[PDB]
Amino acid sequence: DIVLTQSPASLAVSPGQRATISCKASQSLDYEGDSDMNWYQQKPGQPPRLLISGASNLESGIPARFSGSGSGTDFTVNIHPVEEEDAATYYCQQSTEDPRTFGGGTKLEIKRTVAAPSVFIFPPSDEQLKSGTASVVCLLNNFYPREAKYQWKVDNALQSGNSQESVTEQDSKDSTYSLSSTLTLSKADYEKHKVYACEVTHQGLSSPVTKSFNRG
Amino acid sequence: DIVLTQSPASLAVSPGQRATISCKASQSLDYEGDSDMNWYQQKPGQPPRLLISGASNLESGIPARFSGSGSGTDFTVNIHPVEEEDAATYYCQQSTEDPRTFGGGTKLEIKRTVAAPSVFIFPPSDEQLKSGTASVVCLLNNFYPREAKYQWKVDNALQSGNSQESVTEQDSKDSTYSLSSTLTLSKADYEKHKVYACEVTHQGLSSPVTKSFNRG
Amino acid sequence: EVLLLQSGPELVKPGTSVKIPCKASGYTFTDYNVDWVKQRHGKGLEWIGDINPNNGGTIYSQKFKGKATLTVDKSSSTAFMELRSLTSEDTAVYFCARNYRWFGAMDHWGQGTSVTVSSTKGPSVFPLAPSSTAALGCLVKDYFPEPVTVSWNSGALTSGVHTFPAVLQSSGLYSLSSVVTVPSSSLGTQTYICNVNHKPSNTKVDKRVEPKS
Amino acid sequence: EVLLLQSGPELVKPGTSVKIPCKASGYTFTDYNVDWVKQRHGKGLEWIGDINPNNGGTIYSQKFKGKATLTVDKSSSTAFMELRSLTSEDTAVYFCARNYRWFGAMDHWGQGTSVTVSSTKGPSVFPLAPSSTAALGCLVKDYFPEPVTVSWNSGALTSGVHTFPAVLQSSGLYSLSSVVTVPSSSLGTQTYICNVNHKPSNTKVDKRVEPKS
């Protein structure tokens, strides 16, 4: 009765991240030059799939993102990179000694993809001031998920009803959105204030980001 | 320039209700034994459809639910009954004198169908008490819309976690739901209290209805 | 190519014996061992044992010696596992799998046969008598498994009838209620008998519903 | 059977003249008068007039004498209405309809031709210069109607580019912004010219975007 102890019990990882699971064995698995250590992915409601047989040998049709490892008592399956399709319980198993035993399994949770917005402020062009109207633009670029509270603040004063906003259709690949808010004023209402700014909040950001420019 | 004044300007009616619209005319429409009064239904984003030509004569393919009316200065289109398909602006129009003039139109809004629940309480059967367990059942029958807050109250005491509930699939025809909550207790926990009741709230009801029974 | 095929979900009574197939195809079959593995709901993988189809030789895990019996049919290219003295402890998905043998790796797995070992139970049927249109019904209670079908007056009565969806209780038994609204005048004449079919227990229960004295 | 067919939605400039067709079919045509009716957004029905296709005789409402001209083509079984000196006041769905004549009832109506009378305007194109990867863009502003298409460096540049959906302003004019993220190093070399097509005004506007002195 060889006890295989998987570590960790549960990990949450983002696609793009490298993840590693570990099987410790109560005794050595090394016999006749190989170690009889095998790893199984079980996706929910599906039978297990073998990935790695002999702590190294990748099974046919398993991506190279999955790798094998070592010998004695220390074994490690590595996912480099992790993909969304990788959400499953990973089981380690020995065939060194009867009875064939399985590790306790490791639950691999794919973390919800979070994309912080690239925030950019833009002052009105000279060519526009000459034409009599001022239009400041705040770009929230490639953010996920959709929910995002931004606000125009001119010389630390919350503006209202003087800005419209458009939003890009969610991107096919990375599911990211972009938002463009256009604060519009008169050349008068523009040469009146100094620091035109834009405070942005989103899960992705630690603290709200404020893009600002002077010489208003 | 004959002015036709429709009355009312907007009515909201439930399907099943009889509704009547009225065209008052600044002068008589009676000429050579008939009145040249015509009514049009215009559904949103569709051209008008003639229903009634000559304050009586139904147009081909218009349901009998629509009726004509009178003469002189007083005209009336009647919908008996009203159906959901009847949501439209009804226009009255004269051809007695050039220029052919239209009434101001009457906006007919079909009211959201609201069905109050028929509430029924049921005491446990003798055959069940003998078997050792008590099961009280509160039926909310044929209610619409789905949202409905009911509560078991035994001798004016809010019960909790001692009742499960099932809900019927929304009916094909009348869109009505039914709910059955089964408060389960021991024969002991049953012979302990007196008035087993059930307070039900729903849009349909003026005030919450409480079905109750004694001899617990 | 390589396909292992097992039976669908089995309901079975405590103290009986299920024989689970495994139809092997797209490979030699007689050249590879077939391992068996038990998995309980949201728990992990337990090895039962393996059989070499050539000689029919079998290795068992200790925990399963005397519970499981691994068999085969070379002629029909099909493995078999017979579980006996069935208890709730044996409710689990059971998997056959092809053994790579060099590393003793389960290389191709069967879809798995979910085996549930509990007693099938017909419903108790208590009436819901009215006391004042009025509503009456019967409450089907404590049944396993789904489904139960409910007619009224031998299917003669069909309007007003709301046979509700089933509700699983803590006990692990189901319970629905069938109710019908009827004219409060016909209470004094028309008899109301709800009929309760439960093909699982070959049960058919009739219950007259009659107002409380 | 009886079908009246009108043209689709017309955009037209103030001070010009639209001729609206009405293709009559499934009836005699030359036997029934064709009435015309104006409807503004979410407002009511205004009678313009009627033409007897036989003689081409026309009655007009006073409000439209000198605005509208009702015509016909017996040969082509088609009515016509020509509105002149077009002003915003003439933005409306226009309906042809068959006259029952005995009760002067519009018995079958045309789908209606929605006519909008405003001036089509090419966009002003102001640049969105960066100051520190950096983002730059141009803001298309004050255009009518949709659509405008925006390329970058004559379509050579395509990655990082977010041409946003259009936004209607109070003015009744549209305004979008097209932005592109680019390496902050290439600011000193690569030239960034956004190209703004607007097939409605046969406009194509190029604008270099260059960091603020």
- Whether A62 and A51 have beta carbons less than 8 Å apart is answered as yes
Query: How many CA atoms lie within 13 Å of C100's alpha carbon, on the beta-carbon side?
Result: 21
User: Rounded to an integer, what distance in angstroms lies between the CA atom of residue A94 and that of residue A38?
Assistant: 6
* CB-CB contact of C39 with C113 (8 Å): no
Q: H or E stretch including B178?
A: strand B177-186
- Between the alpha carbon of residue C211 and those of residues A160, C132, C138, the distances in Å are 67, 10, 13
Domain final position from D72, D96, D117:
D117
In contact, D49 and D64? CB cutoff 8 Å: yes
Cα–Cα distance measured from residue B9 to residue B5, given in angstroms and rounded to the nearest whole number: 9
Chain A, nearest residue to D135 by Cα: A120
Q: What is the 3-state secondary structure (H, E, C) of C60-96?
A: ECHHHECCEEEEEECCCCEEEEEECCCCHHHCEEEEE
Number of H helices, E strands in chain A: 2, 20
How many CA atoms lie less than 13 Å away from A25 in the CB half-sphere? 27
Mark which of D92, D117, D142 sits at the end of a domain. Answer: D117
C10 and C73 co-located in one domain: yes
D24 and D109 co-located in one domain = yes
Name the token pair of D132: 């520190």
Mutate to test the interface with B, among C124, C128, C206 (most CBs of B within 10 A): C128
Alpha-carbon gap, residue C119 to C144, rounded angstroms: 8
C72 neighbors C78 (Cβ within 8 angstroms): yes
Question: Which of the residues A122, A135, A162, A169 would you substitute to probe the D interface, choosing the one with the greatest number of D C-beta atoms within 10 Å?
Answer: A122
Q: Which 8-state DSSP code applies to residue B125?
A: P
Q: Mark whether D8 and D68 lie in a shared domain.
A: yes
Q: Do D10 and D101 sit in the same domain of this protein?
A: yes
CB atoms within 10 A of CB B188: 9
Q: Which residue of B has its CA nearest to C142?
A: B133
Same domain for C105 and C136, yes or no, is no
Q: How far apart are CA D164 and CA A143, in angstroms?
A: 15
Number of domains in chain C: 2
Q: What is the DSSP string of D145-175?
A: SS--EEEEGGGTB-TTEEEPPPEE-TTS-EE
What whole-number distance in Å separates Cα of residue C67 and Cα of residue C18? 11
Which phi and psi (to 5°) does residue A22 adopt?
-135, 135
Query: CA–CA separation, A7 vs A53, rounded Å?
Result: 19
Interface check for D35 against chain B (CB to CB < 8 A): the answer is yes
Q: Which residue has the tokens 């599906």?
A: A46
Residues C13 and C57 in one domain: yes
- Are C211 and C187 spatial neighbours (Cβ–Cβ below 8 Å)? yes
From chain D, pick out residues whose CB is under 8 angstroms from the CB of B34. Answer: 103
Going by their DSSP bridges, the two strands C34-39 and C45-52 should be labelled as antiparallel
Domain holding C137: CATH number?
Answer: 2.60.40.10
DSSP strands (E only) in B56-147: 57-58, 66-67, 74-79, 88-94, 101-102, 106-110, 118-122, 133-143
Query: Cβ distance C147 to C164 under 8 Å?
Result: no
Contact of B154 with B196, CB cutoff 8 Å: yes
Q: Do C106 and A50 touch (CB under 8 A)?
A: yes
Single-letter code of the amino acid located at C4? L
Whose structure tokens read 């991240």?
A: A17
Please report, as a single letter, which amino acid is at residue B128: Q
Of the candidates D96, D117, D138, which is a domain's last residue? D117
Torsion angle (degrees, nearest 10) of CA B165, B166, B168, B170: 70
Resolved by: X-ray
Resolution for this experimental structure (Å): 2.8
Nearest chain A CA: its distance from D108 CA (Å): 42
Question: Are D52 and D7 in the same domain?
Answer: yes
Could you tell me if C155 and C140 lie in one domain? yes
| Domains recognised in chain A with CATH numbers | 4-110 (2.60.40.10), 118-214 (2.60.40.10)
Using the beta-carbon criterion (under 8 Å), do A53 and C95 form an inter-chain contact? no
Q: Distances in Å between the alpha carbon of B3 and those of A98, B23, B101, B104?
A: 101, 10, 7, 9
Phi first, then psi: give them for residue A125, nearest 5 degrees.
-75, 145
Rounded distance between C-alpha atoms, residue B211 and residue C128, angstroms: 15
Q: To which H or E segment does residue A190 belong?
A: helix A187-191
Residues D102 and D145 in one domain: no
Which single residue is written with the structure tokens 């300007």?
B9
Residues of chain A contacting C100 with CB distance shorter than 8 Å: 50, 53
Query: Omega into A8 within 30° of 0, i.e. cis?
Result: yes
Residue C136 and residue C111 share a domain: no
> Are both C81 and C133 inside the same structural domain?
no
Strand partners, A98: none
Comparing CA positions, the residue from C190, C206, C200, C212 lying closest to residue C152 is: C206
Contact assignment for A100 to C47 by CB distance below 8 Å: yes
Structure tokens at B139: 């039926």
Range of the domain at C45: 3-117
Longest dimension (CA), chain D: 81
Assess whether chains A and D touch, using the rule of 3 or more C-beta pairs within 8 angstroms.
yes
Name the helix (H) or strand (E) containing A127: helix A126-129
Residue where the block lists tokens 């012979």: B191
Domain match, C22 and C79 both: yes
Backbone angles phi, psi at A112, to 5 degrees: -55, 125
